[model samples]
Target chain A: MNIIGFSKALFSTWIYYSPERILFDAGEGVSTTLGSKVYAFKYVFLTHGHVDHIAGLWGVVNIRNNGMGDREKPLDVFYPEGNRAVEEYTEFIKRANPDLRFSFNVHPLKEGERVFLRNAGGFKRYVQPFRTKSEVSFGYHIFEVRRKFVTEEYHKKVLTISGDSLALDPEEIRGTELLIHECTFLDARDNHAAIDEVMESVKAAGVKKVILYHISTRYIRQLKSVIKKYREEMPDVEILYMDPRKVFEM
Target chain B: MNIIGFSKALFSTWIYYSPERILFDAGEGVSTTLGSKVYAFKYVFLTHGHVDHIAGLWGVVNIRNNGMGDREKPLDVFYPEGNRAVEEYTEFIKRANPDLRFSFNVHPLKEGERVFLRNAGGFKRYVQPFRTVSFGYHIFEVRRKVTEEYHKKVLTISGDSLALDPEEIRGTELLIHECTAAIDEVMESVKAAGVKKVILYHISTRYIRQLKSVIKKYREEMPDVEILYMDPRKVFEM
Candidate 1:
């Protein structure tokens, strides 16, 4: 399980989780930075519709449309409901390429619903919605694989993915070896109170390992020192920083 | 000697001219409108920074960059000073291909100054700045085949061009061709001002030949109908 980071922005976030390729927020640098390895991109999971989060979509779709070989498989994009950004972008694509055959389905998620993505010979994705306090928004928790204990000698492992959200209950994130969360800001600021509250809430969640992402460039230096302090404070738990354009493996 | 209208905007004012193998304007529909003849384009001459005038630039550059054969000859684009739009677009091309051996020079034109573009093959372009009132603007009156004859044939062409002060010259006819639309408005005003004997050229394709016939009928009524199709490479002695 390799994880790759591309760059950071309030608008866009691109992370590649495997050589098999699953993209988190297809923003800028999709062509020059990621177009080379895009052959493995079977699924693109979107977090929201902000321009930074979805700007690179058209470039990626153009590459896939003009790409050689069997690109017949649909590139799946999952997002929260009432995201007008994603809808507008897709409408633009339809106007550009009327005969474009590659299918893409947008599934609106809810707070409590869980999506299970299994990597068989190909990729398979299914989503359910959960309720949340945010404006018609939903958090997504994905179980990549399921573990089965047939005997003491045999055991199975599963991978998990979390789209952007405030925080999740421990029961929702339990049994997951790794957790990916959005850490948009460090320590509460005038505009970053929500992020601070979310981080505080996640601290109480029983996540074995927490990966912080969706960071701002202004807070990068301070975030590094704060993560170190949090590491020392929470000695029993592991906290890691997510670098853009790097790949992570399970 | 053939000049095909490449792109039309604001009622067919914008045009791309090509006397020989050299392309001018590279505007919309240059690829599809020109059909297979586009492959013969050896050089491109840009008029200005307006989108309708230079919209097809990237597409033409991309085709030439990807195609085989001697693409080593750099595509030259000519524009006035302070044209930053084309400059920024070309910078991105340089970043994409570091070894891309293409030279682009922007020649600034002073009013009435001329730059002669002549290759080793005797293909010469006498680029002169015509009388334009605004800053950073010029109408190129190109002479393709230059002979030592006493009276030289010259074609005065405008790229998204218009003369603001129409009444500056009265009855001084020197093939005063212009893109004409809103016929009722122009004719009513021009007739009232005692100005006549104007040739309306470059009508919109959407209006079909109806625009031509209507202008011809109007010319007949006004007795100055010198309507003629623009022939490419043909010498029209002044």
Candidate 2:
């Protein structure tokens, strides 16, 4: 199972899980709130280098460096290559805290490169990276191990995170459990082409459960109404709106 | 007549009439924009040590030390006492260009202490330090010579500022101006308590004309509504 919910401020989302933790996009509040939750973080997966998305990185560094005890391990931040802003931000953090022994590894992901984390039992923790049409954007797909294959079990539990892009292949996401995608604007009438054209992809993907996230504050209050309208059109699909601070199990 | 307008983000306002060429607040953009206009800058009057207000002080030091072709005079920056932010910022600049011989004198002002500008025909610059009720707060007053027998036809210009307590001011004419929005709330709550003349200045571009209209509408209530406009490079009386 995985905990899923997104904070609203421009376009940013964060999804975390226990044992092996991962953050989708490191926005402003993620560091302040999540940094205090634990001493050291496992991984921080970045979508893009927009001001709203990466603004909270400084807070994270400050909290971690200023925490009471010594940090055993360094934090790992993953992002797309050639993003200059992230590089500048990392350098700024280094300049701010020279005595910090902890190191940060900036891993650049390539398209279709699958990063697997296997537990002691040899079960694979599925994490697939996909390149998007945007010059500097990538999407992620996370798969969890389920029970032994009983009868016709293709793919166990899966969660897909779309990081700001219009050209996403839904067929590649077939048999996935939950899909957390960006919905910046309310509808096609608002001139946001990416969200306007996402419905067909979601339908074709046949995702069992779907949670729409990264919504603007104007539409966040009215998310229930929007979900109701979408449900009336497609009752078979269990599409729900994600809250900012709530945690979801599995 | 004084040239008054909101400077760029860092430095809020610049008036070039006095001999010292008084800058209301020395922010990040002060040296770049105003440094090119004047042949020599004598003094810089600072409001507070917030990054926005004092970030451009480094730019001024840089130009004076390196950019000036053959200028010999040093720049003076006047600020409140015990402002550590300004001290650290200038120290960093000095570290960069050590050979750049420029004198920076930091003067801490006390409440009701009158500071005189030696160059501008000996005009008086008064200090009315406000109470530190809020975080990163400072307020000062600048008064010019009025049409009295001893002092006549002298002009006064305030910096990017406000009044904490209006009863502290005792002058013939006062320049009580603010940059941030919600000026009416500040005036009704604090600044409207005292003074003779109220000249509004250091306004943002978005609220420049609208603020003028608001001041005009309240002219009857305010009695003295003189909106000051700052020119790029001009020397005037007050």
Candidate 3:
């Protein structure tokens, strides 16, 4: 499974979270960046209905439907309920390429809504979503999201499970094997969550690892080694900074 | 001038014509593809208002307004006149990013209507509008139009200060075109259009492997008509 795409605060975000072929948000250049991989998409959990996040939806559906791909497998999108921008785009693509040879599907999700992902054994993996968030933190039990992630590539099946939230009580994420936590600052200020929040959460929950994404470009340089400090102090747990344009695979 | 973009016939298309600082069509990946360049755009010309061509309008306008960039230059869009989808998007973006920090202007154009591009003097560059027979074809002003039937559908050729020209090359130097249908037809058109120099673009992936035989004949027929193929991301002097 390969995890690709990019993220930045107030700009855009999209994750080609592989394994289950699930993606969170469409972002600006997803279709082009993914190229042929656009066909592999089966489930897309859209975080917001706003500009950059949802803009690439039409490209995915239009390409898969019209550009020599499996039209039988449906492309499903779960956006916020009452979102009009995504609604407008659904119709926008149809009229744009009325001759498109396949069907594109869009579904709505509300607060407290959760969706199932790729099947493992007899059960399907779960993605418990919240509302600033498919921004996605895919997990099985919300309690079992203990993840193994770091600046270096390791057990690479990553998931988009959180954004702009304090790293939960390590206890809450102890079961999570690969958590995608948010990190805007090493300190708590404004609406952004800092690295200490995640560090505290990992230690508290006893969670193993995570990749701090939704990074801000302004501090990308300053934050490059942000995980190093945490890595040494909490040697038991690992942390990774999600860098744009880098692909992580298992 | 530099022309950069991704184009696959009937699949997707967006051209970043640098010198003019203009964009032709706003395909889905454009915002992400163009990235920071979105802010430098002075104008956007919509060849057709269908989704593949216009769905990315929000990406360009919103990014330029909200993201970090030169927020002073106004973004102008000259879309095919009376195109309902374009009109809806013009309003959609305003409501979407209601607090945009810069000016975004959407101009509608009718057939035969022309828009002047970046210029230092009276020889202002221009884009001539036409109703495309298909949704994906592109055209430019004063660049003689060339047509041919490849798969029952026809393609029109346009000139660029990115590639080449078509028509009686009386005063013409080159012709830029996509040869998707018939290579013979392309050579015949190039030979007939009369440009001494040429550049190929808008090439579909299917015909990629079959290019050699066609180019051989094309070269034999019009050896003097210089053909140039610049690798992706390569800059060349026009």
**lDDT, candidate 3, B124-167, per-residue tens:** 35655544322222333332125532211112334121222233
| Model 2 lDDT tens row, B1-238 | 3433234322233334333366556533344334354336666666666444554455455555554565456777766666665665565445443554354555666533445554333444333344331111122233344554343213333344454344443333544445452566445633354444554444544565566667666655666544343321222234
Ranking, DockQ, top scorer first = 3, 2, 1
DockQ of 1: 0.02
- Native-contact fraction for each model? 0.00, 0.00, 0.38
Write down the lDDT that model 3 would get.
Answer: 0.61
Question: Considering every candidate listed, which one attains the maximal DockQ?
Answer: 3
Clash totals for all models, in order?
A: 29, 7, 27
Error of 3 at A198 (Å): 3.1
Using TM-score, rank the candidates from best to worst: 3, 2, 1
Error of 2 at B102 (Å): 27
Query: Which of 1 and 3 is the better model by lDDT?
Result: 3
* Candidate 1 accuracy as TM-score: 0.46
